[PDB]
Coordinates of C-alpha atoms and ligand atoms in Angstrom, one line a residue:
Chain A
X1 CA 0.0 0.0 0.0
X2 CA 2.6 2.6 1.1
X3 CA 4.2 1.2 -2.0
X4 CA 1.3 2.6 -4.1
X5 CA 1.6 5.7 -1.9
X6 CA 5.2 6.7 -2.3
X7 CA 5.1 6.4 -6.1
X8 CA 2.3 8.9 -6.3
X9 CA 4.3 11.4 -4.2
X10 CA 7.4 10.9 -6.3
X11 CA 5.1 12.0 -9.2
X12 CA 3.6 15.0 -7.5
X13 CA 7.1 16.2 -6.6
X14 CA 8.1 15.6 -10.2
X15 CA 6.0 18.2 -12.1
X16 CA 6.0 20.5 -9.1
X17 CA 9.6 20.8 -10.3
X18 CA 8.5 21.0 -13.9
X19 CA 6.8 24.2 -13.0
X20 CA 9.8 25.4 -11.0
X21 CA 12.3 24.3 -13.6
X22 CA 10.1 26.2 -16.1
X23 CA 9.9 29.6 -14.5
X24 CA 13.6 30.3 -13.9
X25 CA 15.0 30.2 -17.5
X26 CA 12.1 32.5 -18.3
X27 CA 7.2 39.2 -16.9
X28 CA 8.8 37.0 -14.1
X29 CA 8.9 40.5 -12.7
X30 CA 5.1 40.9 -12.8
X31 CA 5.0 37.2 -11.9
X32 CA 7.2 37.4 -8.8
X33 CA 4.6 39.8 -7.4
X34 CA 1.5 37.7 -6.8
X35 CA 1.5 36.7 -3.2
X36 CA 0.8 33.1 -2.2
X37 CA 0.1 31.8 1.4
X38 CA 2.0 28.8 2.7
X39 CA 0.9 26.4 5.4
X40 CA 1.8 27.1 9.0
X41 CA 2.7 23.5 9.4
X42 CA 3.1 21.0 6.6
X43 CA 4.3 17.6 8.0
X44 CA 1.6 15.0 7.6
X45 CA 0.1 14.1 4.2
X46 CA -3.4 15.4 5.2
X47 CA -1.7 18.8 5.3
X48 CA -1.6 18.8 1.4
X49 CA -5.1 20.3 1.6
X50 CA -3.3 23.6 2.2
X51 CA -1.8 22.9 -1.2
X52 CA -5.1 22.2 -3.0
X53 CA -6.5 25.6 -1.8
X54 CA -3.8 27.6 -3.5
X55 CA -3.9 25.8 -6.9
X56 CA -6.6 28.1 -8.3
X57 CA -4.2 31.1 -7.9
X58 CA -1.2 29.0 -9.2
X59 CA -3.0 28.7 -12.5
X60 CA -4.1 32.3 -12.8
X61 CA -0.4 33.1 -12.1
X62 CA 1.0 30.9 -14.9
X63 CA -1.4 32.3 -17.5
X64 CA 0.4 35.6 -17.1
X65 CA 3.2 34.1 -19.2
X66 CA 2.0 32.8 -22.5
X67 CA 2.4 29.1 -23.4
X68 CA 5.5 29.2 -25.7
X69 CA 8.2 29.4 -23.0
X70 CA 7.0 26.7 -20.6
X71 CA 7.4 23.0 -21.5
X72 CA 4.2 22.3 -19.6
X73 CA 0.5 23.1 -20.4
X74 CA -0.6 25.3 -17.4
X75 CA -4.2 24.3 -17.2
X76 CA -2.9 20.8 -17.5
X77 CA -0.2 20.4 -14.8
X78 CA -2.4 22.2 -12.3
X79 CA -5.3 20.0 -13.4
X80 CA -3.0 17.1 -12.8
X81 CA -1.5 18.2 -9.4
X82 CA -5.0 18.7 -8.1
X83 CA -5.8 15.1 -8.9
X84 CA -2.8 14.0 -7.0
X85 CA -3.5 16.4 -4.1
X86 CA -7.0 15.0 -3.9
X87 CA -6.3 11.3 -3.8
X88 CA -3.6 12.0 -1.3
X89 CA -5.6 13.4 1.7
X90 CA -8.7 11.2 2.2
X91 CA -9.7 19.1 9.3
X92 CA -9.3 22.6 8.0
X93 CA -6.2 24.4 6.5
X94 CA -4.8 27.0 8.8
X95 CA -2.5 29.5 7.1
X96 CA 0.8 31.3 7.8
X97 CA 1.3 35.0 8.3
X98 CA 4.0 35.9 5.8
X99 CA 3.5 35.7 2.0
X100 CA 5.8 34.1 -0.5
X101 CA 6.6 34.3 -4.2
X102 CA 5.6 31.5 -6.6
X103 CA 9.2 30.3 -6.4
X104 CA 9.4 30.3 -2.6
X105 CA 6.0 28.6 -2.9
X106 CA 6.9 25.6 -5.0
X107 CA 10.3 25.3 -3.2
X108 CA 8.3 24.8 0.0
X109 CA 5.9 22.1 -1.3
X110 CA 8.6 20.4 -3.3
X111 CA 10.4 20.0 0.0
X112 CA 7.2 19.0 1.7
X113 CA 7.2 16.0 -0.7
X114 CA 10.9 15.2 -0.3
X115 CA 10.3 14.8 3.4
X116 CA 7.6 12.2 3.1
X117 CA 9.5 10.5 0.3
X118 CA 12.5 10.2 2.6
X119 CA 10.7 9.2 5.8
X120 CA 9.0 6.4 3.8
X121 CA 11.5 3.8 2.4
Chain B
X1 CA -10.5 -10.1 -25.8
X2 CA -10.1 -6.4 -25.6
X3 CA -6.6 -4.8 -25.2
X4 CA -5.5 -1.1 -24.9
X5 CA -2.2 0.7 -24.2
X6 CA -1.4 4.2 -23.0
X7 CA 1.3 6.2 -24.8
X8 CA 2.1 8.4 -21.8
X9 CA 1.0 11.6 -23.5
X10 CA -2.5 11.9 -24.9
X11 CA -3.2 8.7 -26.7
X12 CA -4.9 5.3 -25.9
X13 CA -4.7 2.6 -28.6
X14 CA -7.3 -0.1 -28.7
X15 CA -7.8 -3.7 -30.0
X16 CA -11.1 -5.6 -30.1
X17 CA -11.8 -9.2 -31.0
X18 CA -15.2 -10.9 -31.1
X19 CA -21.8 -4.0 -37.5
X20 CA -20.7 -0.4 -36.7
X21 CA -18.5 -0.2 -33.6
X22 CA -16.8 2.3 -31.2
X23 CA -14.7 2.6 -28.0
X24 CA -15.6 5.1 -25.3
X25 CA -13.1 6.3 -22.8
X26 CA -14.5 7.9 -19.6
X27 CA -11.9 9.1 -17.0
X28 CA -13.2 8.5 -13.5
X29 CA -12.0 11.9 -12.4
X30 CA -12.0 14.2 -15.4
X31 CA -14.6 16.4 -17.1
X32 CA -14.0 14.8 -20.5
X33 CA -14.5 11.7 -22.6
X34 CA -13.5 10.5 -26.0
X35 CA -14.4 8.0 -28.7
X36 CA -13.5 6.8 -32.1
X37 CA -14.9 4.5 -34.7
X38 CA -13.4 1.0 -34.7
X39 CA -11.9 -0.1 -38.0
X40 CA -10.9 -3.6 -39.3
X41 CA -7.5 -5.0 -39.3
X42 CA -7.3 -8.8 -39.1
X43 CA -10.3 -11.1 -40.1
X44 CA -12.1 -10.6 -36.8
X45 CA -10.0 -7.9 -35.1
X46 CA -10.6 -4.1 -34.8
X47 CA -8.3 -1.3 -33.8
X48 CA -8.7 2.3 -32.7
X49 CA -6.9 5.5 -31.5
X50 CA -8.3 7.6 -28.7
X51 CA -6.9 11.1 -28.9
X52 CA -7.0 12.6 -25.5
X53 CA -5.3 15.8 -26.4
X54 CA -2.5 17.7 -28.2
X55 CA 0.3 15.4 -29.3
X56 CA 2.5 15.9 -26.2
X57 CA 0.0 17.2 -23.5
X58 CA -0.3 15.1 -20.3
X59 CA -4.0 14.2 -20.2
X60 CA -3.9 11.2 -17.8
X61 CA -2.2 10.5 -14.4
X62 CA -1.0 7.5 -12.4
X63 CA -4.0 7.9 -10.1
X64 CA -6.5 8.3 -12.9
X65 CA -8.6 5.3 -13.8
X66 CA -10.3 5.4 -17.2
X67 CA -13.3 3.2 -17.8
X68 CA -13.1 1.7 -21.3
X69 CA -16.2 0.4 -23.1
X70 CA -16.7 -0.9 -26.5
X71 CA -20.1 -0.4 -28.1
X72 CA -21.8 -1.8 -31.1
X73 CA -25.1 -0.6 -32.6
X74 CA -27.9 -2.9 -31.6
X75 CA -31.0 -1.8 -33.5
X76 CA -32.2 1.5 -31.9
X77 CA -29.5 1.7 -29.1
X78 CA -25.9 0.9 -28.5
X79 CA -24.7 -2.4 -27.0
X80 CA -21.9 -2.7 -24.5
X81 CA -19.6 -5.3 -26.0
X82 CA -16.8 -5.2 -23.5
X83 CA -15.8 -3.3 -20.3
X84 CA -12.5 -2.6 -18.6
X85 CA -11.2 -0.5 -15.7
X86 CA -8.0 0.8 -17.3
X87 CA -5.1 2.2 -15.2
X88 CA -3.2 4.1 -17.9
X89 CA 0.1 3.9 -16.2
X90 CA -0.2 0.1 -15.7
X91 CA -0.6 -0.3 -19.5
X92 CA 2.3 1.7 -21.1
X93 CA 3.6 1.4 -24.6
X94 CA 5.7 4.2 -26.0
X95 CA 6.1 5.2 -29.7
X96 CA 9.3 4.0 -31.3
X97 CA 12.2 6.4 -30.8
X98 CA 12.7 8.8 -33.7
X99 CA 15.2 11.1 -35.2
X100 CA 17.8 8.4 -35.6
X101 CA 21.0 9.7 -36.9
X102 CA 24.8 9.0 -37.0
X103 CA 26.6 11.0 -34.5
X104 CA 30.0 9.6 -35.6
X105 CA 31.2 6.9 -37.9
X106 CA 34.7 5.5 -38.0
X107 CA 36.2 2.5 -39.9
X108 CA 35.9 0.1 -37.0
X109 CA 33.3 2.1 -34.9
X110 CA 30.0 3.9 -34.9
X111 CA 28.1 6.3 -32.6
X112 CA 24.3 6.6 -33.0
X113 CA 21.7 8.8 -31.3
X114 CA 17.9 8.8 -31.1
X115 CA 15.0 10.7 -29.5
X116 CA 12.3 9.3 -27.3
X117 CA 8.9 10.6 -28.6
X118 CA 6.2 11.8 -26.3
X119 CA 7.5 10.3 -23.0
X120 CA 5.9 11.4 -19.8
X121 CA 8.2 13.4 -17.5
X122 CA 6.7 11.3 -14.7
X123 CA 9.1 8.6 -15.8
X124 CA 12.1 10.9 -15.2
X125 CA 15.0 8.5 -16.0
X126 CA 13.4 5.3 -15.1
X127 CA 13.5 4.0 -18.6
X128 CA 15.0 1.0 -20.5
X129 CA 16.2 0.7 -24.1
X130 CA 16.9 -2.3 -26.4
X131 CA 18.9 -1.9 -29.6
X132 CA 20.1 -4.3 -32.3
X133 CA 22.3 -4.3 -35.5
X134 CA 21.6 -5.8 -38.9
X135 CA 25.0 -6.8 -40.2
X136 CA 25.5 -8.2 -43.8
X137 CA 25.6 -11.8 -42.7
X138 CA 22.4 -12.1 -40.6
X139 CA 18.7 -11.2 -40.5
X140 CA 17.0 -9.1 -37.9
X141 CA 15.7 -12.0 -35.8
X142 CA 19.1 -13.5 -35.4
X143 CA 20.5 -10.1 -34.3
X144 CA 21.6 -9.9 -30.6
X145 CA 19.7 -7.7 -28.2
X146 CA 21.8 -4.8 -26.8
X147 CA 20.8 -4.0 -23.3
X148 CA 20.8 -0.5 -21.9
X149 CA 19.5 -0.6 -18.3
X150 CA 19.5 3.2 -18.1
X151 CA 18.1 6.2 -20.0
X152 CA 20.7 6.6 -22.7
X153 CA 19.8 8.1 -26.0
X154 CA 22.9 6.9 -27.9
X155 CA 25.0 3.8 -28.4
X156 CA 28.6 3.3 -29.4
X157 CA 29.0 0.2 -31.5
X158 CA 32.4 -1.4 -31.4
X159 CA 33.9 -4.2 -33.4
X160 CA 32.7 -3.1 -36.8
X161 CA 34.2 -3.9 -40.3
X162 CA 35.3 -1.1 -42.6
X163 CA 33.2 -0.5 -45.8
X164 CA 30.4 -2.6 -44.4
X165 CA 26.6 -1.9 -44.7
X166 CA 24.8 -1.8 -41.4
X167 CA 21.2 -1.1 -40.2
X168 CA 20.3 -0.2 -36.6
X169 CA 17.1 -0.2 -34.6
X170 CA 16.1 0.7 -31.0
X171 CA 13.0 0.5 -28.7
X172 CA 11.9 1.8 -25.3
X173 CA 10.0 0.7 -22.3
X174 CA 9.1 2.4 -19.0
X175 CA 10.0 0.6 -15.8
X176 CA 6.5 1.3 -14.4
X177 CA 3.4 -0.9 -15.1
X178 CA 2.2 -4.5 -14.8
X179 CA 1.2 -4.9 -18.4
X180 CA 3.7 -2.4 -20.0
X181 CA 5.4 -3.8 -23.1
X182 CA 8.3 -2.7 -25.3
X183 CA 7.6 0.0 -27.8
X184 CA 7.6 -0.9 -31.5
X185 CA 11.1 -1.0 -33.0
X186 CA 12.2 2.4 -34.4
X187 CA 12.5 3.1 -38.1
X188 CA 15.6 1.3 -39.0
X189 CA 18.5 3.7 -39.4
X190 CA 20.9 2.8 -42.3
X191 CA 24.6 3.6 -42.2
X192 CA 27.9 2.5 -43.6
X193 CA 31.5 2.5 -42.2
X194 CA 34.5 4.4 -43.5
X195 CA 37.1 2.3 -45.5
Chain C
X1 CA 31.8 42.0 7.6
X2 CA 31.7 38.4 8.8
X3 CA 32.8 35.3 6.7
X4 CA 30.1 33.4 4.8
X5 CA 29.3 30.1 6.6
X6 CA 29.1 27.0 4.4
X7 CA 27.3 24.0 6.0
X8 CA 27.3 20.6 4.6
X9 CA 25.5 17.4 5.8
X10 CA 27.6 14.3 5.2
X11 CA 25.6 11.2 4.2
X12 CA 23.2 12.6 6.8
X13 CA 25.6 11.3 9.5
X14 CA 26.7 14.7 10.7
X15 CA 27.2 18.3 9.6
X16 CA 30.4 20.4 9.3
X17 CA 29.9 24.2 9.0
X18 CA 33.1 26.1 8.3
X19 CA 34.5 29.6 7.6
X20 CA 37.8 31.3 7.0
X21 CA 38.3 33.9 9.7
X22 CA 41.8 35.0 8.9
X23 CA 40.6 38.0 6.8
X24 CA 42.9 37.2 15.6
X25 CA 39.3 36.7 16.7
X26 CA 37.1 33.9 18.1
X27 CA 33.9 34.2 16.2
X28 CA 31.0 32.2 17.6
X29 CA 28.3 30.1 15.9
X30 CA 24.7 29.8 17.0
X31 CA 21.8 28.0 15.3
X32 CA 18.1 27.4 15.4
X33 CA 15.2 25.8 13.4
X34 CA 12.8 28.5 12.3
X35 CA 9.0 28.0 12.4
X36 CA 9.1 24.6 14.1
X37 CA 9.5 22.6 17.4
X38 CA 12.5 23.5 19.6
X39 CA 12.7 27.0 18.3
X40 CA 15.1 27.6 21.2
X41 CA 18.5 29.0 20.3
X42 CA 21.2 26.3 20.7
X43 CA 24.9 27.1 21.5
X44 CA 27.6 25.2 19.6
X45 CA 28.6 22.1 21.6
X46 CA 31.4 21.1 19.3
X47 CA 33.8 23.6 17.7
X48 CA 36.2 22.9 14.9
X49 CA 39.5 24.9 14.9
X50 CA 42.1 26.3 12.5
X51 CA 45.2 27.6 14.2
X52 CA 43.7 27.7 17.7
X53 CA 40.9 29.7 16.2
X54 CA 37.3 28.8 15.7
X55 CA 36.9 27.7 12.1
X56 CA 33.6 25.9 12.2
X57 CA 31.0 23.9 14.2
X58 CA 30.0 20.2 13.9
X59 CA 26.4 19.1 14.4
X60 CA 25.9 15.4 15.2
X61 CA 23.1 13.2 13.8
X62 CA 20.6 14.0 16.5
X63 CA 21.0 17.8 15.9
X64 CA 20.3 17.5 12.2
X65 CA 16.8 18.0 10.8
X66 CA 16.8 18.2 7.0
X67 CA 13.4 19.4 5.7
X68 CA 13.3 21.8 8.7
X69 CA 14.6 25.2 7.8
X70 CA 18.1 25.6 9.4
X71 CA 19.2 29.0 10.6
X72 CA 22.9 29.5 11.4
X73 CA 24.4 32.7 12.9
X74 CA 28.0 33.8 13.2
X75 CA 28.7 36.2 16.1
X76 CA 31.7 38.5 16.8
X77 CA 31.7 38.3 20.6
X78 CA 33.0 41.9 20.9
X79 CA 30.0 43.5 19.2
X80 CA 26.4 42.2 19.3
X81 CA 25.8 44.3 16.2
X82 CA 28.3 42.3 14.1
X83 CA 26.2 39.2 13.3
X84 CA 25.3 37.5 10.0
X85 CA 22.6 34.9 9.6
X86 CA 21.7 32.3 6.9
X87 CA 18.6 30.2 6.5
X88 CA 19.4 26.9 5.1
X89 CA 17.6 24.1 3.3
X90 CA 19.5 21.1 4.6
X91 CA 18.2 18.5 2.2
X92 CA 19.9 20.4 -0.6
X93 CA 23.3 20.2 1.2
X94 CA 23.6 16.4 1.7
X95 CA 26.7 14.8 0.4
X96 CA 26.6 11.0 0.2
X97 CA 29.6 8.9 1.0
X98 CA 31.0 7.9 -2.4
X99 CA 30.0 4.6 -4.1
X100 CA 31.8 1.4 -2.9
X101 CA 32.3 -2.3 -4.0
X102 CA 32.5 -1.7 -7.7
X103 CA 32.1 -4.9 -9.7
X104 CA 31.9 -5.7 -13.4
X105 CA 30.4 -8.9 -14.9
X106 CA 29.4 -10.1 -18.4
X107 CA 25.9 -10.9 -19.7
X108 CA 27.4 -11.7 -23.1
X109 CA 30.8 -11.9 -24.8
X110 CA 30.4 -8.2 -25.6
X111 CA 28.0 -6.7 -23.0
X112 CA 28.9 -5.5 -19.5
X113 CA 27.0 -4.5 -16.4
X114 CA 28.5 -2.2 -13.7
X115 CA 27.2 -2.3 -10.1
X116 CA 27.8 -0.5 -6.8
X117 CA 26.5 0.1 -3.3
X118 CA 25.7 3.2 -1.2
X119 CA 26.6 3.7 2.5
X120 CA 23.1 4.5 3.9
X121 CA 20.6 6.1 1.7
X122 CA 19.5 4.1 -1.4
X123 CA 16.5 5.3 -3.4
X124 CA 17.6 8.8 -2.6
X125 CA 20.8 8.9 -4.7
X126 CA 21.4 9.5 -8.4
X127 CA 24.7 8.6 -10.0
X128 CA 27.3 9.6 -12.6
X129 CA 29.1 6.8 -14.4
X130 CA 32.4 7.8 -16.0
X131 CA 34.4 5.5 -18.2
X132 CA 37.3 5.7 -20.6
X133 CA 39.5 3.2 -22.4
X134 CA 43.3 3.2 -22.7
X135 CA 42.4 4.9 -26.0
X136 CA 40.3 7.9 -24.9
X137 CA 41.4 11.4 -24.5
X138 CA 38.4 12.0 -22.2
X139 CA 35.7 10.4 -20.0
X140 CA 32.4 9.2 -21.4
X141 CA 30.0 10.2 -18.7
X142 CA 26.4 9.0 -18.2
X143 CA 23.7 9.9 -15.6
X144 CA 21.9 6.9 -14.0
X145 CA 19.0 6.8 -11.7
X146 CA 18.3 4.8 -8.5
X147 CA 18.8 1.4 -10.2
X148 CA 22.4 1.4 -9.2
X149 CA 23.5 -0.3 -12.4
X150 CA 25.0 0.7 -15.6
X151 CA 25.1 -1.3 -18.8
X152 CA 27.8 -1.1 -21.5
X153 CA 26.2 -2.7 -24.5
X154 CA 29.3 -2.8 -26.8
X155 CA 32.8 -3.3 -25.6
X156 CA 36.2 -3.9 -27.2
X157 CA 38.2 -6.8 -25.8
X158 CA 41.5 -5.6 -27.2
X159 CA 41.1 -2.4 -25.2
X160 CA 41.3 -1.9 -21.4
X161 CA 38.5 -0.1 -19.6
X162 CA 38.3 2.1 -16.5
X163 CA 35.1 2.8 -14.6
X164 CA 34.3 5.2 -11.7
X165 CA 31.1 6.5 -10.1
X166 CA 30.0 9.4 -7.9
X167 CA 26.6 10.1 -6.3
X168 CA 24.3 13.0 -5.5
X169 CA 21.5 13.6 -3.0
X170 CA 18.8 14.5 -5.6
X171 CA 16.0 14.9 -6.6
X172 CA 13.7 12.8 -4.5
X173 CA 14.8 13.6 -1.0
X174 CA 16.5 16.9 -1.7
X175 CA 17.9 19.1 -4.4
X176 CA 21.6 19.1 -3.8
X177 CA 24.0 20.3 -6.5
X178 CA 27.2 18.9 -5.1
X179 CA 28.5 15.3 -5.8
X180 CA 30.3 12.9 -3.5
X181 CA 33.9 12.2 -4.2
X182 CA 34.6 9.5 -6.9
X183 CA 34.5 5.8 -6.0
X184 CA 37.7 3.8 -6.3
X185 CA 37.9 3.1 -10.0
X186 CA 37.9 -0.5 -11.2
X187 CA 39.4 -2.0 -14.4
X188 CA 38.4 -4.4 -17.2
Ligands
LIG201 C1 30.8 7.2 -27.3 C2 30.4 8.6 -27.3 O1 31.3 9.5 -27.3 N1 29.1 8.9 -27.2 C3 28.5 10.2 -27.6 C4 27.8 10.9 -26.4 O2 28.8 11.2 -25.4 C5 27.2 12.2 -26.9 O3 26.3 12.6 -25.8 C6 26.4 12.0 -28.2 C7 25.9 13.3 -28.7 O4 26.8 13.9 -29.6 O5 27.1 11.3 -29.1 C8 27.5 10.0 -28.7
LIG202 C1 34.1 15.3 5.2 C2 34.5 16.0 6.4 O1 33.8 15.8 7.4 N1 35.6 16.7 6.4 C3 36.4 17.0 7.6 C4 36.4 15.9 8.6 O2 37.2 14.8 8.2 C5 36.8 16.3 10.0 O3 36.6 15.3 10.9 C6 36.0 17.5 10.4 C7 36.6 18.0 11.7 O4 37.9 18.4 11.5 O5 36.2 18.6 9.5 C8 35.9 18.3 8.1
LIG203 C1 39.7 12.9 13.0 C2 39.2 14.3 13.0 O1 38.6 14.8 13.9 N1 39.4 15.0 11.8 C3 40.3 14.5 10.8 C4 41.7 15.2 10.9 O2 42.7 14.2 10.7 C5 41.8 16.3 9.9 O3 40.9 17.3 10.3 C6 41.5 15.8 8.5 C7 42.8 15.7 7.6 O4 43.9 15.5 8.4 O5 40.7 14.6 8.4 C8 39.7 14.5 9.4
LIG204 C1 40.9 33.5 21.4 C2 42.1 32.6 21.3 O1 43.2 33.2 21.3 N1 42.0 31.3 21.1 C3 41.2 30.4 21.9 C4 41.9 29.4 22.8 O2 42.9 30.1 23.6 C5 40.9 28.7 23.6 O3 41.5 27.6 24.4 C6 39.8 28.1 22.7 C7 38.7 27.4 23.5 O4 37.6 28.2 23.8 O5 39.2 29.1 21.9 C8 40.2 29.7 21.0
LIG205 C1 26.2 -4.0 2.6 C2 27.3 -3.4 1.8 O1 27.1 -3.3 0.5 N1 28.3 -2.9 2.4 C3 29.6 -3.5 2.3 C4 30.2 -3.9 3.7 O2 29.3 -4.7 4.4 C5 31.6 -4.5 3.6 O3 32.2 -4.6 4.9 C6 32.5 -3.6 2.7 C7 33.8 -4.2 2.4 O4 33.8 -5.4 1.7 O5 31.8 -3.3 1.4 C8 30.6 -2.6 1.6
LIG206 C1 23.0 15.3 -25.0 C2 24.2 14.5 -24.9 O1 24.2 13.3 -24.7 N1 25.3 15.3 -24.9 C3 26.6 14.9 -24.3 C4 26.9 15.8 -23.1 O2 25.9 15.8 -22.2 C5 28.2 15.2 -22.4 O3 28.8 16.2 -21.6 C6 29.3 14.8 -23.5 C7 30.4 14.0 -22.9 O4 29.9 12.7 -22.6 O5 28.7 14.1 -24.6 C8 27.7 14.9 -25.3

């Protein structure tokens, strides 16, 4: 079971980095402005809910940049993360005070994944 | 029997064996569906291509389950001929690698590259390749399988004969999946050694 | 203007954080984990020295929490105002111990497979295989994932081969840029 469960995470992580690895080589000015909110505490898997909530903005942010630069279809990846994020919880999301950039955002969830992907196997 | 394979991008290929007939693909957690008319191949076998999206867009996920139904007209209505609960990532088959080209030929050596076509980034590097060489003395079947247990989009062939006609082929398979099978062989790349 | 601290976590066995101070003063190091449990400020319990002068600090296994944001702080003890702090992502700083027990073995008269082990972590390490023959001016290198194997599908018996491997804590449990040192090469 956990065996089914770690593989999914590995995947989530994976195109979380596709977004990251797609916004750096890149209006990243105007893009680095939008202000996301990060969880106060992201340790257990059920915390991922705090990730689902922000996805709507994540899309509205990526559609600032047209689709030629990125090697990922924005509506798609999001559409796909959501699906992961959903199957992975199964409570209410309480947010943090400070606000972070899309980059500081992904970095944080990417890491969130790497934690659980370490602590299992 | 009713068999389908997912190409890891936006395409599900279908085979049906038992007049108008179709396959319907209904993702258990998407707001879309897709169909296509089944066309004949063998005497009593039909094939079909379900286009989920743009050629390289990622339309399905490893948590997705797509219900696959085959339907044939039965008077007024449609009849459900076959049903399957299809986990796309458990039934992977990739296109044959493309853009085969000689990176570097010598008289006793050769270096050949290829591209994987429409491979999901979810695989990262967990891929496998098989390659083989048609030398003048043998046929393709008798040609040894060259094992690359890693993602490597080139091969350096040693122990070649100068002024010798060779053909080369390579195929690809993800590590993931219970029913995943090798891709079809790539278009054979033809090349010849220096004297 | 205090020296930049560079901290590195070794095979997640312990952490060495060093700085060159010679540019004579005993600077101090203090560290804490922001936004988490035990947000208390901990004093360095183990100093590393260069010429009877503080040159770093060493944190042992139990003090190390990858995945928890690590804040380290250098202090000039003369002036409270002269302090410099760095927030660190520790999972991006892990250096694995280099690959060991390199072995080659044939699966055909012309096809080789290279294998190796890792000291602790396993699914967490990616690898770089470098090889060259007595004929090459340069290394052929090739990245390989967590199947710690490497296949060599076409080899020349008349030639003599050299293989070596180094590892990297990336990208599943961290995003480290730095590689381990090379394994002991082995020959064919
Ligand atoms: C044996 C050898 O040198 N292999 C090379 C490889 O390093 C390179 O990545 C590729 C692209 O030019 O061509 C081939
Ligand atoms: C890899 C590593 O830890 N490098 C050295 C280590 O050998 C030594 O024990 C420590 C204390 O001097 O400083 C550093
Ligand atoms: C044992 C220890 O504490 N540290 C050692 C020490 O020999 C030195 O710092 C370095 C090279 O000599 O290797 C490490
Ligand atoms: C400031 C200085 O000259 N060097 C000191 C040394 O004398 C002392 O034994 C050591 C332990 O705290 O710290 C260093
Ligand atoms: C389990 C493993 O792969 N680690 C081995 C270790 O047990 C052995 O002592 C060493 C020297 O032969 O090689 C390495
Ligand atoms: C795309 C590709 O394979 N290019 C490679 C490059 O990555 C590598 O640095 C070099 C040496 O092996 O050979 C060439």
